[PDB]
């Protein structure tokens, strides 16, 4: 009977993956955007007998630091960094954020 919960978990968490992809996918043609890659984690439920259930929790391990492909605009002050490079920017609260 509690199996439904595990299944529910999966369904719910799959929607979260969908959400990520959607935000990951609407953001094409957003300058320098870093795709937020996602994964699903098995979560065992260690208990007092017969460890049989595992949940499907959704996660985003990080961002895809694969350099997106360049558009030539000839504008004098449009900048493209080399691979693994970042421009440092004074964030809203005030701290060195990094952008592409």
């Amino acid at each position: 009977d509690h199996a439904i919960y595990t299944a529910m978990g999966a369904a719910s968490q799959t929607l979260n993956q969908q959400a990520v992809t959607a935000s990951n996918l609407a953001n094409a043609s957003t300058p320098g955007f870093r795709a937020q890659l996602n994964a699903l984690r098995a979560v065992p439920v260690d208990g007092l007998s017969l460890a049989t259930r595992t949940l499907v929790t959704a996660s985003t391990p990080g961002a895809d630091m694969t350099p997106g492909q360049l558009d030539y605009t000839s504008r004098p002050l449009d900048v493209a960094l080399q691979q693994d490079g970042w421009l440092v920017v004074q964030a809203a609260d005030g701290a060195e954020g990094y952008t592409r």
């Binding site: 509690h2 595990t6 065992p44 595992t54």
Partner: protein, 132 residues
């Protein structure tokens, strides 16, 4: 506990555990990592007959859940952590068709045992009206 209720109830417990394992497999198919960081190894249950001393028959016990030791199909993402030399993520080896059939068959067996229990309960409650 009357013997036949025990037999059918053990069947119910075994079927519930089998269906739970199948659901966990079907849910964590395509799960990169476990807690510590290792593949999710696909899980199976072991059905054995109960009442070992006496009559050699009766009930089903699902002690000792085990793991299906198939070679854990790989994928190639050599930027992902959890990838060894020859970057090869481990990618649980759950066959969805097998697990769906397991769920269907487990539900049907569960129904059969439930409905055996109902039949037997009626049988005994009718036995109580023996004579009077």
């Amino acid at each position: 506990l009357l013997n036949i209720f025990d037999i059918a109830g053990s069947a119910l417990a075994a079927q519930s555990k089998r269906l739970n394992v199948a659901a966990s497999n079907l849910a964590n198919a395509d799960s990169v990592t476990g807690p510590d960081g290792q593949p999710y190894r696909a899980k199976q249950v072991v059905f054995q007959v109960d009442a070992a001393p006496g009559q050699a028959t009766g009930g089903v016990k699902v002690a000792s859940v085990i793991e299906s030791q198939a070679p854990e199909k790989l994928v190639y993402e050599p930027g992902n952590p959890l990838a060894d030399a020859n970057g090869y993520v481990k990618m649980p080896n759950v066959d969805v068709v097998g697990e769906m059939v397991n769920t269907m068959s487990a539900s049907r067996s569960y129904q059969a045992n439930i409905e055996v229990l109902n039949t037997v309960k009626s049988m005994m409650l009718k036995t109580l009206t023996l004579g009077q």
